[PDB]
Amino acid sequence: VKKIPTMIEGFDDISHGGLPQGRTTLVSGTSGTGKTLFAVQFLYNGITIFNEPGIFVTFEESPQDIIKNALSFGWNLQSLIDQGKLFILDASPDPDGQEVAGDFDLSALIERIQYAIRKYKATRVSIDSVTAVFQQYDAASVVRREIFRLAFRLKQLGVTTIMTTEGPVARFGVEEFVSDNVVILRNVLEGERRRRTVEILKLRGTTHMKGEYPFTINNGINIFPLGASGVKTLDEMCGDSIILATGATGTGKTLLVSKFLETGCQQGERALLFAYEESRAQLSRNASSWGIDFEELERRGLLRIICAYPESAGLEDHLQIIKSEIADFKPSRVAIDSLSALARGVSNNAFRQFVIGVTGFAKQEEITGFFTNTTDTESHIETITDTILRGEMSRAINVFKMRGSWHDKGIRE
Amino acid sequence: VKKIPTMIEGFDDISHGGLPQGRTTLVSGTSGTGKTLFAVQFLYNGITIFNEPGIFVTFEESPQDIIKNALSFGWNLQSLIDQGKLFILDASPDPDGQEVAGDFDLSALIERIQYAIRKYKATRVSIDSVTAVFQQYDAASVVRREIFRLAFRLKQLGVTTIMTTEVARFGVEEFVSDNVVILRNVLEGERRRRTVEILKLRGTTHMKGEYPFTINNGINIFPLGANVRVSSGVKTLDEMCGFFKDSIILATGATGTGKTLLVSKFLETGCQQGERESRAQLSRNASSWGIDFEELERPESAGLEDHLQIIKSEIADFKPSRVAIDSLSALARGVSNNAFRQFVIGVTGFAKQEEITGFFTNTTDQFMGSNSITESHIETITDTILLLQMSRAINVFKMRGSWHDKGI
Amino acid sequence: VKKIPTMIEGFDDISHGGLPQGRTTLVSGTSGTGKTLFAVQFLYNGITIFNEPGIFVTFEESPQDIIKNALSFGWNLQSLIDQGKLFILDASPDPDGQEVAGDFDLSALIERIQYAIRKYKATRVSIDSVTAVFQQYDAASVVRREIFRLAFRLKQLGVTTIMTTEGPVARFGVEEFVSDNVVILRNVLEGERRRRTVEILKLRGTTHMKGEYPFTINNGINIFPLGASGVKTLDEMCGDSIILATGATGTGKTLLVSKFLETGCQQGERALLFAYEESRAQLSRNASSWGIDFEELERRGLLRIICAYPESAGLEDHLQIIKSEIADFKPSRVAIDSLSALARGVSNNAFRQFVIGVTGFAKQEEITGFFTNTTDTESHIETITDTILRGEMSRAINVFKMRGSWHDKGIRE
Amino acid sequence: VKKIPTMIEGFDDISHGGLPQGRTTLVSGTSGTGKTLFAVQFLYNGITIFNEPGIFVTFEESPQDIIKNALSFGWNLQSLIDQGKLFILDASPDPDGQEVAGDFDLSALIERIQYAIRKYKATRVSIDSVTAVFQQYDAASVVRREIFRLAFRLKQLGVTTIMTTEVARFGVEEFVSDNVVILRNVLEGERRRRTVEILKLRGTTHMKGEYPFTINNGINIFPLGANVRVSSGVKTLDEMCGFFKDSIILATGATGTGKTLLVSKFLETGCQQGERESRAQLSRNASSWGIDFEELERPESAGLEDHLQIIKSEIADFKPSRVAIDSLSALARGVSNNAFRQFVIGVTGFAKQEEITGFFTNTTDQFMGSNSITESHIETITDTILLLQMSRAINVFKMRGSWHDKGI
Ligand SMILES: Nc1ncnc2c1ncn2[C@@H]1O[C@H](COP(=O)(O)OP(=O)(O)O)[C@@H](O)[C@H]1O
Ligand SMILES: Nc1ncnc2c1ncn2[C@@H]1O[C@H](COP(=O)(O)OP(=O)(O)O)[C@@H](O)[C@H]1O
Ligand SMILES: Nc1ncnc2c1ncn2[C@@H]1O[C@H](COP(=O)(O)OP(=O)(O)O)[C@@H](O)[C@H]1O
């Protein structure tokens, strides 16, 4: 049994060591899901890290436009291609189109590929959009056979190879069966939003991860599924898997997190802001109502803000924003605003997928976290939630329990 | 790398900088969703702001009928064509139709295009309904080749181009392209919502998903960005709060028992400084309190975002200090109560950026001791919140952007 | 920009001034939704009101049967056709069918049309069922082209023209795309009832109304969407957008409405009955239990009854029944029985569509109305609702509030 | 203008006057839904009541087998054919099948029809399954033409005609016609409901929608139209009400605790004047109270409207004074409790028009203090209503068609 690394941000561990070797890998998805991009990033990881030389075969695209494509994420290729990098086989269609006086055997292409390889020492080659080859030549007979002779030749040469091809979940095998291990990238549309996800049906004769898992793009494709106060009466009432403030609207947790972090700045540990609600002037005039000094609390090099409206972005992209925020600036202690907004407008398995993700990341990078949310939690989710909190009546937060014991059980009796 | 503005109202930011440059972008939607409009208005935007001349290729529509189209928006194109700026290329089928005796090399059209551009120096080109040639020519073979050489030739010329093609489906033999917007018209319940989905721009920063839109003079879209408090006054008790000028108030209570309309002195203050549900019958009912309406003057019928934009341009027209929204509950329903309206957050955000003051009325469900606050439930983002309702019963809920007496 | 009036009962205001002019209007719907009828009524409005002479082209139907069709609604045409009315071009198929020895250009038909027009001074022409022309001649090639040359010719002549053509909501463009502004009439079937509705996708280069709206038929097609006690302790408890009696089963509101109107008859203002429940003998033996005299209250020329079982008829047809009841006899004050029945068996957006309709009509034609309904309102709808109402316990109706103040707040304390 | 009766049980009023006249009406349904039956019985109705002779054209069915069909309904047609009244035209395919050497002019059939009519003077014609010729002749071209000239020829002759054709679909290449009934057989849950939908009659008064039906001798359908009170007596307390002879009573209570069966003296009164859940085991249980059943004699298994019509003709058979319905809850379920039964209103209406007295049993859901009254909830239309059930607890709900003591 064989295997080869890729190190696409978080894909490899699902394949438990990457793609098969000496075997043909087919990648299929609906138009607009970054198949070509997957090929590019794959091979660029290869040549940059492993110096595993590459061949990028393109039918749909023009080279100049594929380089101007990839240059978006900050990868400069042709100047570095002069190093003997990756070689782009141009299989873009002759614009004048072609006429036929008989049938063809696409020996020219495959032999061209193998000279290109045996010149470039390449052990890795990607191939963009075979369906275009089916829509290039209107003879759907032969292209099957000669794509097959290609993939077989690549299996002989033992090189790692990739194929990209074009309704997602339903009957999806496109039109080109003919391959030996298959990744299907689908982005599903639900309600009025978009979830980019990767399914691996199975990798034949090799360990594979069970099921489909959502992803997003950065400089290279990412997802990582699988894991595994100070102030106030503070501790008097209390005696980390993050704190929870679950409360009726106007939860005023704003207080608790604001000076949860403000003390943090006092003691010198690093703090950060991550708020998805109020315009942060009102965030700290509601905080400047306390008499604290937030704009004075940030002589830079200490905290960062720029808020973000929840609905304006998909949830796990927010997850990435704060992932590499907390990665860029390494806070000791931070707090998260209004889980409530993320609690609705979203199928609660998405929202809880998310909350398990963030809770898991924060709990064991031993970073301390807070979380606020407002009730009508009525999303019912229990578990790993740690600390929770004559005429008129005022607000009275108090705790059940923490850790494994101690605090106050009874409220403000 | 690179991208080009459209400056059509609210699309440019969805594409994170407008349409791509030197590449042909395909625009597709089901018939009757204003693709042609997007194209026309695209070239008109180009030419009016940038003096970037345009070539509009039209099969389906008739040229003179495209101008009689455009005069609805109040724009004179024939004057613009004589200005030597925009050219409407007539590629409409001769009504006499076609007879066929062989295969085609569709060079004629493309050469016509490139002569038109290289004469007008044009940097913008729209192409309305390539699908029409498919409804003209029964050969799905060659048109592949000639569309590809067209779009490619245009990329040699480097001009930005648009192709229009004919619910949640694919592209009906239009062949993949290198950047694609699919604007879809949705039919839900018993009303119809026009939305724009942008599928892909390859190698470029892009916004996530489908986004609702409506039409004005040009297409309008809804993206997503972002005395210490002069208020009413109200006698007896005079604001325990007041409601900050940059705030919004929430009165949630069973029934529309708020007929008293607290907005009465919310407005009285407005007029005080001099600054500015039959609302006729309610305003002989408002003169029951003793206010001076006759001297004060010196829902299903519209889609939600039509309410949103109409009021956008009322408040744009007259610069209100403080106004209120009547029976938001009514706007919450007629839509069935599980269809969750983002909407209110949008306008709320808007209130935040122009120091405009808003009040909000809404009717709550049952009566006594409902732990449930509001029907489909308006929570935070609302600055000022309050209750309502043995007698009628006012109370304050919870705020700490200020503090005071917790009522009753 | 151009426009032309039609005055079909309530259609024009959606088109904000009617159909386009000098442009081809296509009308499509599933079989059995009154497309042909729409054409007929259109042109009959034209010639009767505007003296805009007309041409009715028919492929499917035979003239004699189209006149016997239209004569159902009380329109007598052929005798009036002698006036130089509308001209029916007979394009009914030769029953013997036809044989083919080559292809045809349908010049005969179009030229016939234009002579007919230039003889009849016509500015308006309707055309019934083009799909039949596709199912008349089995050559689906040419009929496209020559229908196109027809519609184009009509655009040249500047005449207003209409085309009728044959699964409703889903993929509906029939088979004949070829037109320049489109009305789609669909009747949907839900549960076990039928809703006739009009959708206008868009009218090209012209104002159009946003969305689809239900309709029914009378003498001509109708719909109008878009708008915009006395006795008892009476007012002691109270101190018009209609009254509401919402109550537990056996709401006995029957009392309150019965002599709500009976006093009305006393004072002389006009009253009417609109009951959708009990056989009206029991209606007024439950009322003759009060000692009142209903059959004696109606010496005719005062009130009218004839009850109607809710389920036996679609809701907005009831709406029309009372619309032209209250229009025929002009009541001052009336009451409506058992909104409860209409509250269930119906998707509540239909029921509330309805209730907003009737409430709106009654409130500002300044007619006074009452409404009874029984709870298990639990349909939750608030707003424009005005006035609402040791061992055993009896019934006790009392009010919250009315207008903007006064009445009794407290019940029968 | 004009229309002609069918006098088939309950269809005529759905069409607001029966089938159209001088026009060919198409009858379509999925195979196995009794279209042929509608046709046969149509012509038999015509001929038996009006002595309006009929021509029945049959492809699918065999003539002798159509008579052995009809003998199920107890009707002798062969006697009617020899009476010189009805003629069953055999257009069944010769089992030996067909060979083809060219195109057809299907004049033979039509000329046969018109000879048959002009001989029998017939005014009624049925045509069962034109679709059969489509399952006979593989040319979908000409049959268009010959069906059209058939139906048209029949309209010259002015006779009323019916065409039968072969779930919620269209017409499977049958071509549009000028008035159409689609009778559909529905499959829901795990039972099947036959309904008749009537799609259109052009230029004519018509009823709205789909309407459920069942079969008897002829098809039956369910349209929609429309001592001061001798009752039980019951000792101790003797009717605080009594329940009027034209009334209906409602006893709603948790469980079938009404085993006491108030109907006991509701019936005792019936016998008193002399006028007329194992109901065997319940009637050794009824003899536990001391009544005299042995001397008294001097659900899923059937569809709802089969219960309705069966009881329609029991009450038609025996003219009851007063009878009651056992455990209506049971009829409310076995159907899943959201499937709302109109049904009970229908029979209720019926009770109103023949002075028949009815009582109704039903079991309610939980127990104490349910603001909810009845499960799927029976409200008004019920005249007399009552409650049931620390001990058992009778109480009266609310009526003012009379007044009395509000119980307990
Ligand atoms: N900066 C960026 N941010 C987000 N997405 C990007 C960015 N640059 C490129 N993309 C995405 O890359 C995708 C290109 O892949 P795709 O559309 O599937 O083309 P192909 O089929 O050739 O792979 C586009 O859909 C685009 O949304
Ligand atoms: N008063 C108006 N209001 C809204 N839209 C208008 C108006 N006048 C013209 N238009 C636009 O002109 C466009 C013509 O384009 P059209 O061909 O309808 O696009 P599509 O190809 O989607 O049918 C219409 O879609 C419509 O949006
Ligand atoms: N008095 C009437 N009441 C209700 N509907 C009627 C009346 N007279 C005619 N109609 C309706 O008119 C319709 C005729 O239009 P349709 O069936 O669509 O035929 P076409 O396709 O030729 O327009 C019929 O469906 C019929 O229900």
Ligand SMILES: Nc1ncnc2c1ncn2[C@@H]1O[C@H](COP(=O)(O)OP(=O)(O)O)[C@@H](O)[C@H]1O
């Ligand atoms: N005892 C019976 N009960 C009910 N229906 C009967 C009985 N005997 C005969 N029939 C009727 O005879 C009809 C023959 O017509 P059929 O060909 O079944 O119509 P379809 O074309 O819908 O299958 C049956 O549909 C059935 O309704």
